[PDB]
Design a binder for this molecule. Sequence first.
Ligand SMILES: *[C@@H]1O[C@H](CO)[C@@H](O)[C@H](O)[C@H]1NC(C)=O
Ligand SMILES: *[C@@H]1O[C@H](CO)[C@@H](O)[C@H](O)[C@H]1NC(C)=O
Lengths: 50, 99, 78
Amino acid sequence: SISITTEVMPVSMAKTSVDCNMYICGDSTECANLLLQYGSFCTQLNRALS
Amino acid sequence: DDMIAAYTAALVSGTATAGWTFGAGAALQIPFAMQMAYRFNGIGVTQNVLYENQKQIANQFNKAISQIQESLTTTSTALGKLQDVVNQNAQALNTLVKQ
Amino acid sequence: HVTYVPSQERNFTTAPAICHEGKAYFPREGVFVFNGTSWFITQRNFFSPQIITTDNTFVSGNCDVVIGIINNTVYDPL
Ligand SMILES: *[C@@H]1O[C@H](CO)[C@@H](O)[C@H](O)[C@H]1NC(C)=O
Ligand SMILES: *[C@@H]1O[C@H](CO)[C@@H](O)[C@H](O)[C@H]1NC(C)=O
């Protein structure tokens, strides 16, 4: 006999990006000024996601 | 790096002198044309095709090696996935310093 | 894992092809071996000498292009 079998495999997932300034300090200038000295931490996350 | 170079030199010498038999066990000596004949016989082509066109095959082999050498003397990004490792390690340590 | 390991190597004198009345005989599978008296054909992984006959070999071309061809005889069963 001749049989046909199916096989399903994942290949890729969803590409995503985050914005530190909006997640942490949404439309606040004082919070953005206070966040200004954590910039090295945020560029690492963006590099990982990219 | 000298030890790894010695390992690769030993492997290339064993391939060029013994062939394929030094992995299953003790090395068996064989002339290179007969080994080439076995490699040709393994892909479904009879070995007389090797024995009647040996000059052309040898010239094409030498030309391909020379082309690889000429390709590797010009600046390019052929080894671009070895540079990413050293870049990532240096950048991680510098990120800790800046952090 | 159960595996097969060859051993007890032995040296022989070998040839690429044999010439016989102006025609070249190449083995189908195996190698040409010389034991000091005459030429035989054997498998590469085990030593079992066989007489070089027309069933063992096949014909391709004349004997002026293959490097290292030798003179010998081929037994025809008739
Ligand atoms: C060659 O093979 C023959 C088989 O007929 C054997 O009698 C002889 O001993 C072999 N030669 C040597 C040197 O062993
Ligand atoms: C025997 O071999 C030689 C070369 O090895 C060749 O010149 C000669 O013609 C051969 N003998 C016969 C009868 O063909």
